[PDB]
Design a protein around this ligand. Structure first.
Ligand SMILES: *CC(=O)Nc1sc(-c2ccccc2)cc1C(=O)NC1CC1
Lengths: 305, 301
């Protein structure tokens, strides 16, 4: 029993974190087989970052301009290239701790675990969701750049995120492991802002199902609604539209608790219009939106890695 | 920027998790050097839940009655003994993945990471605190027993909790790694009730200092308070008493933000009176009490 914001065990990813230094910039790289992946902005100085030409800045660099440290050993860089916004440094040694892995791109609303590191040294792990505005509500201090986000399914690590930058509102922007930004962001020291965020409706409903499974039932009512009725309410409170795919994904939770998704929507409608009237749900006074349906089912059935 | 409940990286603990079976009971054990630590109730049948006589059940066991599984490998048990409520199984292989570690007994209000495990396989990692009533608000299904709580400071793993049982209120009780329970609990299925849960006042203050460091000042006020007047108000909201120790411990965060401990106590007093008025502090609509002064200095520097 109980319900906690739960990260994947980080051990398979800890074995891949290295320090990458180019001149006076140090940040984190991901070492898989014989390639280290890290943000391309590692080749920039303060001045360069104002308006960088990357293909230009990179052409000037020799392999020995990249110091890669794995724990307290040196890796020899034998090659370098860019893919979008990530620098791929080829090294002479395959990482013997390389796990089974894939690079995947996640959709907004999907969650993942972030291993925060500093100087190639993992310091913490937390669970994040990709916001609808493509930012993450992370916790990063200077030297966190190149920290990665991952999911585990069976023994296979799915890397989905690499940290590139903080936005002026305290939130974080990065790329998939192929160097494609999540959101309308660029790796340049310029004026960029998080767009208006919205609430991930399917995740709130998942968390309401988590609450019911843990015996927190006060918000249930006799009422049901329709998608269209509900979506007009959602739009009004800055909630993402709920689609038929969403209802289908919540299906198992609807069957395990006897509460139909449009039944639970009628509960969420009422929490949106009236508030929580002094009560909490799973010890929270806000509606939690960073648990997916899969996350609720996984934690309430004890799947291991 | 940002502020998140962060757990420690779990890798050093994952390399220590095994499966212990005795009869038809399977739970988790912690493999360090050539010893596997697990809850002694692994040797209980359903006949033994209310009034187990552990010394009598244990003396009836051989080494070969204990199946220990590390991944796919079976480990050979060459010795067994009981220390308080933990069973210590000696095995013939030292765990090659043994980290630098120590056992520590923690005080209420202290935080640690839990590696939740089933059948010796890690499922997830989360951060929690020892509540004043010596329980933890964890996430634990059947088979999670022997999952451990830990802190990692530099490269050294401090093991501070092993999970033994769920209380009727859905909260969790367990031991240090010397097998002494936290709180008044016992490894018996008789009625035991969690003492009243209180809010960890020193932690809420630390988190209010965190909100100032990250640039939020809306809840400060012009008042101060005496220690004793603070405690007289706070206990009416089920808050733990703040001691001179807690006031000393908040010293660095005071110095860093230029807000005296007793001025921050005055703010908390007003927060308890007013609630938030639709505002949030570090993304929360309640007062967070599961970050310690030490965690705030760690995550905000
Ligand atoms: C942690 C917990 O609830 N303890 C467990 S796990 C367990 C079991 C039984 C069969 C298959 C897999 C796991 C048994 C218990 C338990 O509470 N009772 C044990 C007999 C003493």
């Amino acid at each position: 029993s109980g319900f906690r914001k739960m990260a994947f065990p980080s051990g398979k990813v800890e074995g891949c974190m290295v320090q990458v230094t180019c001149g006076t910039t140090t940040l984190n790289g991901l070492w898989l087989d014989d390639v280290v992946y890290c943000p391309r902005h590692v080749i920039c100085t303060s001045e360069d970052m104002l308006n960088p030409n990357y293909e230009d800045l990179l052409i000037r660099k020799s392999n020995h301009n990249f110091l890669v440290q794995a724990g307290n050993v040196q890796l020899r860089v034998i090659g370098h290239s860019m893919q979008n916004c990530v620098l791929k440094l080829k090294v002479d040694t395959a990482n013997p701790k390389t796990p089974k892995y894939k690079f995947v791109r996640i959709q907004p609303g999907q969650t993942f675990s972030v291993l925060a590191c500093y100087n190639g040294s993992p310091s913490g792990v937390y669970q994040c969701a990709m916001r609808p505005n493509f930012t993450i509500k992370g916790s990063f201090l200077n030297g966190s750049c190149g920290s990665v986000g991952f999911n585990i399914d069976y023994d296979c690590v799915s890397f989905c995120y690499m940290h590139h930058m903080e936005l002026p509102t305290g939130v974080h922007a990065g790329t998939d492991l192929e160097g494609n930004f999540y959101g309308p962001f660029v790796d340049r020291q310029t004026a960029q802002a998080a767009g208006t965020d919205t609430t991930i409706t399917v995740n709130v409903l998942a968390w309401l199902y988590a609450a019911v499974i843990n015996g927190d039932r006060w918000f249930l009512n006799r009422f049901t609604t329709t998608l269209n009725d509900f979506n007009l309410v959602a739009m009004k409170y800055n909630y993402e539209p709920l689609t038929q795919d969403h209802v289908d994904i919540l299906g198992p939770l609807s069957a395990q608790t006897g509460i139909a998704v449009l039944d639970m929507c009628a509960s969420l409608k009422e929490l949106l219009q009236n508030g929580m009237n002094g009560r909490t749900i799973l010890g929270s006074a806000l509606l939690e939106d960073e648990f997916t349906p899969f996350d609720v089912v996984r934690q309430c059935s004890g799947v291991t890695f």
